[PDB]
Symmetry: D2
């Protein structure tokens, strides 16, 4: 198996048995359209999910596929959360110059890597 | 010199020459009082400051001194920002059980480590 | 595109034009066979590749697919390197209980995410 | 209290009661003298110390005070370890241009931040 194959895509996440008990797939909130170079908020959150030393969303990575860039993706940010203190809920502020796709990857110490994605238009 | 001594405290930050050109000391926004186990937002931001490959706030660490805990501090979260895409501005969601002090530490690739602190009461 | 698809697999890495100029695919050095619970070294390195503020291997993530684990992978470690000071070369010390596959993912600020993988037998 | 004051210095570490049970102060192995721009290894390790989900050295940060640099320190690298899989033992490869002081900061989820320091001469 390739590393990429191991990641739970949002289409496959829906049919997982664990998903009946808890949610790992990130929710990405962001404007569908933004102006170039103008700051906007992106909120990423995972839940409901346990948040304890033995089981929690340890971190979230935010990436961006920039349309037309010769190589992709760009990592935009990464946030790590202390189990039992910080909820897996973060807001970033970004500025973009070109349209593309935002990817949020969450990591659970028990349940692996889960992906969310969201198109964003820059005009 | 100890490592701790190298960090720019908010009282010393005020008199630094670089501070006339740009701000490194984090701003922490958080309720003065919260209820135990109830989620609340903490916003940490640094600015105005350059945000480019050659010079940016690379990351922010959020720590907590918990009054009465036998050892301190607890790291609550850490966020890294891609230069030129992500602004050094983050919102966390926390739950606390005991009163203490929030510390935000920012890192600039040119200008080092800068500290902000803020008391928080849990009742 | 899924996030997983974006990652440069070691089979695809070979035919990339950029690979004629520089190497992004991690080299993983690790024993083929180890004893359960006994510490061993894993060395991960990327090169030759530029190492400057404007272009460097920013970090490496080490993951493990554990055969028989209900969910995968487990993140084993992550290391970030200061451009121009630290070379993208790290040695970890691990203990494993079960056989599986080590994955090393490198990130270049210009050229994206590149994967290496290596089987490890635990007896 | 300032954030810097909270960090356990190597002189204070010696007299801590917890230090009779386990070691948090990093050991830094590095040449006393190196040539400018020539790669060398720095090994940082913490132990003996528990390594489990509930209690482990979560990460190590490596910093450098560069003599003559207008601001300090520079972060050289940071490594995070999965509890129960990775031992808190890392080797970095560095290149330096100027003399200074290496600082290693370890973090324990129960016992806080502990400092080690080591002079390095560049000739
Ligand atoms: Fe989970
Ligand atoms: Fe600065
Ligand atoms: Fe590259
Ligand atoms: Fe400890």
């Amino acid at each position: 198996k390739s590393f990429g194959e191991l990641i739970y895509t949002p289409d496959r996440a829906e049919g997982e048995a664990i998903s009946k008990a808890e949610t790992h797939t990130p929710k990405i909130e962001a404007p569908e359209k933004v102006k170039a170079d103008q700051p906007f908020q992106v909120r990423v959150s995972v839940g409901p999910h346990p948040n304890e030393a033995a089981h929690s969303i340890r971190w979230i990575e935010l990436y961006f596929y920039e349309e037309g860039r010769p190589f992709n993706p760009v990592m935009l940010g990464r946030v790590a959360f202390e189990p039992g203190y910080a909820e897996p809920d973060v807001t970033f502020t970004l500025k973009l110059k070109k349209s593309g796709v935002l990817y949020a990857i969450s990591y659970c110490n028990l349940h692996g890597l889960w992906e969310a994605r969201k198109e964003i238009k820059v005009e």
